[PDB]
Amino acid sequence: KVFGRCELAAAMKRHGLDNYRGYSLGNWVCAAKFESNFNTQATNRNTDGSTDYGILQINSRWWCNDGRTPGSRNLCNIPCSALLSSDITASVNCAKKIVSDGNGMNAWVAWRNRCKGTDVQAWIRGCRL
């Protein structure tokens, strides 16, 4: 499913992400826009053989099991296919784990390079939250 901006904002807010670990909703929506373009089914393979999955592009090396990334941990105890779902619950639950891991949202390359230090409020502008 390809979410609308405001639609994803509301689903994320409903899932407890607004100000989670201090990150405003604007950050989460900006991250998703640049990681998957709001597409739950996005997947991208990395040079190390790991694959990123879903709306927030969660990596198979540490967070989920895809049956093909040797030596991987499944810190979120979930198959990576669960992350491609129209219901964002699994992606949100795993993300909360990632962001509490130490580096915060710098764990997402697109966030660091394209969202960090920008007016993220613009991402939630005009939405009925």
Ligand SMILES: [Br-]
């Ligand atoms: Br947009």
Ligand SMILES: [Br-]
């Ligand atoms: Br915001």
Ligand SMILES: [Br-]
């Ligand atoms: Br949802």
Ligand SMILES: [Br-]
């Ligand atoms: Br932090």
